[PDB]
């Protein structure tokens, strides 16, 4: 499949570019180094264009490496714009982490979405241990849950409904309209 | 892929609020279609949208992403079966606005949803079956029998089953 194109006023965007024009970032694939570079660059760009306005991040991702995901997370945190997050279909592993890392009150999920916070689905082990202790801690803080609940869910394939993700604290609202 | 005058095909269709679903449903197809639906909905929240389908199926979570988007936006999403609507393509066909679900005379429909977390896939199948039972009007047991087996529906058989509302001629 190829991606459509639209023509606004007289410039021609491709579909995700037209989304980027209204400050929406589409994270819709597995998270690797190149995808992390892409998301980070889009965040830096939107933050540069208007540091005060809000950015949205749509997620439909099975996740990926914790290091790339943490790059994305730190970029969300440091930029002046606050980043809302939405779960389109599937937010797993680092995708789920990034969903829960959204601005409080502005993390969303569609009714038939699913969330799985399973963090993983040699010179670096200490740093992977350093990055693993941070993920559980941030999830605990962002969801109001105790750390021993988080560690228990980030170690198993526990799929959660949008209503379950709401009761867990991962999101703040289910979109219906 | 041809181009007209300047839009390329498919994109030209998108200019008049027509989305094409001619390939299997992976997450890339889903993200693309979701973005298209949202764009159309933001340009004119009132005017109808058309979803043309010719798919052998694909991922449940991707198809459900498209389903949720169709359900969230304001415009009505008519659906048409151009040639084939199987698995989640059939689900998405039946998910169109009731009264505005069409199929071509010789287009076929397969509602069979073939495949791990046992609990989860049981839940996903149950959800698909509930939604289909609602979109068509068949009792739940009939849907459970027909989405679990392999079966073929002509445009007329799909009309009388409740999947579509009118054959185009």
């Amino acid at each position: 499949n190829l991606i459509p194109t639209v023509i606004e006023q007289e410039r021609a965007y491709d579909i995700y570019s037209r989304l980027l024009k209204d400050r929406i970032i589409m994270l819709g694939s597995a998270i690797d180094d190149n995808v992390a570079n892409s998301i980070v660059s889009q965040l830096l760009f939107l933050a540069a264009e208007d540091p005060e306005k809000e950015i949205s991040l749509y997620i439909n991702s099975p996740g990926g490496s914790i290091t790339a995901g943490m790059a994305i997370y730190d970029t969300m945190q440091f930029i002046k714009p606050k980043v809302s997050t939405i779960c389109i279909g599937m937010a797993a592993s680092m995708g789920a982490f990034l969903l829960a890392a959204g601005e409080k009150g502005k993390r969303y999920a569609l009714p038939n979405s699913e969330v799985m916070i399973h963090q993983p689905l040699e010179i670096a082990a200490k740093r992977i241990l350093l990055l693993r202790d941070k993920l559980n801690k941030v999830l605990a803080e962002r969801t109001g849950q105790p750390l021993e609940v988080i560690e228990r869910d980030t170690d198993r394939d526990n799929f959660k409904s949008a209503e379950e993700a709401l009761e867990y604290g991962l999101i703040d609202k289910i979109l219906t309209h | 892929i041809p181009t007209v005058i300047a839009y390329d095909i498919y994109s030209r269709l998108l200019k008049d609020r027509i989305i094409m679903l001619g390939s299997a449903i992976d997450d890339n197809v889903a993200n693309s279609i979701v973005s298209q639906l949202l764009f159309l909905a933001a340009e004119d929240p009132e005017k109808e949208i058309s979803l043309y389908i010719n798919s052998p199926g694909g991922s449940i979570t991707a198809g459900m992403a498209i389903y949720d988007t169709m359900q969230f936006i304001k415009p009505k999403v008519s659906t048409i079966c151009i040639g084939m609507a199987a698995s989640m393509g059939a689900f998405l066909l039946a998910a169109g606005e009731k009264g505005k679900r069409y199929a071509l005379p010789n287009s076929e429909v397969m509602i069979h949803q073939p495949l791990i977390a046992a609990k989860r896939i049981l839940l996903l199948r149950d959800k698909l079956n509930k939604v289909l039972a609602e979109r068509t009007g068949q009792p739940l047991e009939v849907i459970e029998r027909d989405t679990d087996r392999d079966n073929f529906k002509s445009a007329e058989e799909a009309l009388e089953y409740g999947l579509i509302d009118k054959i185009l001629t």
Binding site: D22, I24, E54, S56, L175 | L38
Partner: peptide, 6 residues
């Protein structure tokens, strides 16, 4: 997905 995101 507005309203409200954006």
């Amino acid at each position: 997905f507005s309203p409200x995101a954006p």
